[PDB]
Design a protein around this ligand. Sequence first.
Ligand SMILES: Nc1ncnc2c1ncn2[C@@H]1O[C@H](COP(=O)(O)OP(=O)(O)OC[C@H]2O[C@@H](O)[C@H](O)[C@@H]2O)[C@@H](O)[C@H]1O
Length: 166
Amino acid sequence: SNITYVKGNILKPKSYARILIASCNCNGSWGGGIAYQLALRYPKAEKDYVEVCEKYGSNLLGKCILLPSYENSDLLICCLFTSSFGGSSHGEKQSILNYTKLALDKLKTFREAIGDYLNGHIKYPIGEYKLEMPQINSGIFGVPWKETERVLEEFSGDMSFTVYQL
Ligand SMILES: Nc1ncnc2c1ncn2[C@@H]1O[C@H](COP(=O)(O)OP(=O)(O)OC[C@H]2O[C@@H](O)[C@H](O)[C@@H]2O)[C@@H](O)[C@H]1O
């Protein structure tokens, strides 16, 4: 309903401004999967993510932070902090799903009005960015996509997402 599915790689450039939403661990490790791709392409955004993880660590769970990509003023990154650790040590499915909802709720709040690193780098009003994501939680975090999709659909009327499927 509020989700629009598209086929392809989310990192292929888009002419419109957007926020790339990615589910993250709190341990400062963009180590694998799509996070690693973000670390290679946007290393200054990675440095911000590591800095926040080092300052607050696992107390970030259920929050999100918005980061400039730095390389493209039409691209921001939204980290959803949904697991203390990445890889095999990631959290249990229900924990990740609850943190995914709470973090998406901070994003919705911020768009209606998390943004410390956007100072001086935000090109447009934060509401003008389209919300896009891969199938978050369904790779390294092991959560069936249908269960995340329901979480997304709870924000019907408040937020719309474009979800990329390879
Ligand atoms: N450019 C890409 N474009 C579109 N979809 C992609 C892309 N890369 C991966 N995907 C899809 O998105 C799914 C989720 O990617 P993951 O990186 O495995 O993310 P997630 O399941 O949310 O686990 C997050 C964990 O892994 C790291 O990304 C992060 O550090 C965190 O610890 C993958 O299974 C994959 O199918």
